[PDB]
């Protein structure tokens, strides 16, 4: 509240983020252009990144930024299977250097790598990722829009916020079909789904004016988010469910998804 | 690199030394800032990464321009547009007669526009001081040295504590506030504003405790009425001296009523009640702002 | 400004303008005269902390200087057992480095901060801190007589690069650990 919520620039910052998320958007369906990796390897890598971030107590913004960097790098560069983890590590490192007050050292990133890549290799890959991304490391993420959306709920409910974060992180694992949705749309769908699941409310009328997103235009993303919320227990990658079972996240992954959507 | 013909070099030693070079083919004067990565055991520094990432989006007349980045596995070169001198050098050269009031008004207006542009793009400069403000011959002042800049969220989180230069550090950072925001930058401007009027630093402290005592001496010791929640701050002690607020007539004599009111709003204790860059541009102090040309003695 | 940190008297040395306006500088001529016996009666102790790395210390330094390249070392040497002054004399502490731009000023600021923390305002153990203007390079150029051994070892020498990287890593690790500990102590009692 007050200068913490930036009341003079919040609308300007939101408009700037909306205009920026188009530029930092990865190419849709870049995995077809990749002749050695598919979406399963990407999902495994993102799950491993979630586990790594949970190990070092990194921010969720770091993980979202790292996944964005990985997607952008792969959308313009072709890598082999054995190198994929390396680029992930590099992206994570870069994300930390952009977000964390105390980012982990390169030695730690080689350690969690399990010594399949050396420190020189990690630094070379970091240089390559920085060159390919053209130092465009400031990218809007689902976290950045969800955090702004959380200010429009009255009364506040930390369970809703934690469930929205959990759904937004679940959307990170699967490239299909969340590569075709902007971070703002996924954040809006996650916020509405969390509100419906926890308190039974819907997409606020103060947010349809701010973002222009009605419940009708959020439906294509909402259906997919609901489908993979229902299928979360059966997913091969279960690191996010374990991470969000903790009491700091209010055990949101232990909740029951709604049987049907009132949309 | 070989494309740029080095002409002059300023910055004693190997400490972010900059080179005034000229483009060989187009004859453009640029400033090359050198960053070492062979001596950096952890790759590209976080400060350089943040500065390059955030300066590529800030396109304003009052923000320094990052023309190009020369990327090499052992060296990093940041190419900036060349500006003749910083504001500290200008004040030192103009230490006898002082900076004329219309020039101070124009410089403050331009700095506030640049800060408003920075804040509307979620960037926190966090290193605002006269050494980081670059002027030119035409009469334009620009923010520079975005190495300490950061991109914040709405609302902000807990960020880096040791950021602003001690002379221009906000009282909320000194008192160890959990959250700081754009109001940290405005305070700096306020201090710079006073430094432009009185030709001397407003709060020249040699330590955090001395800096807090100087701020309290000039503006009065805060309490729960002026700054609610100040008594429960981690770095606040109930043993602080109970000083009285000095009237701004003696703090900044040359300033008029409008300038005094703007300075008092910029130096507000409570970050919530502190003025913003966007709201400062609408102040009556800038009713008759005109842009003069500095003499540029140096 | 024009008074020492405890606000009791002015600075004895002829101050020189420097890169940092926070601190008070002295050109190598003043320290050359001081080491030549110019203020024997008015100065009780004269400390010249060589804030450079030890491999620079072995490559030439001012006579009577003490090499303290770490903040913990300086706190141990200066503040754990402070040099008690008396009436009629003053204790002057001079910091320097290769160029007196990053390391010497940082050590001077750290000493002032730790002296303020450990005392009651405005009492200070070392109210007179100077930084040698131009660093050790200018002193070597102008006062090579007092530099034993008469040699100059740059920080970015083609040799001792591993030592420089190790020392930088140690400084970075210490600063990061101190910052994290302070942040935790602040957030536990916010």
Residue numbers in the entry:
A (entry chain B): 168 to 430
B (entry chain A): 1 to 298
C (entry chain C): 335 to 524
How does the study describe this entry?
The cell division cycle 25 phosphatases CDC25A, B and C regulate cell cycle transitions by dephosphorylating residues in the conserved glycine-rich loop of CDKs to activate their activity. Phosphorylation of a conserved tyrosine (equivalent to Tyr15 in human CDK1) in all eukaryotes, and additional phosphorylation of an adjacent threonine (Thr14) in metazoans, located within the glycine-rich loop (G-loop) of the ATP binding site, inhibits CDK1/2 activity. At G1/S CDC25A activity is most significant in dephosphorylating and activating both CDK2-cyclin A and -cyclin E complexes. Here, we present the cryogenic electron microscopy (cryo-EM) structure of CDK2-cyclin A in complex with CDC25A at 2.7 Å global resolution.
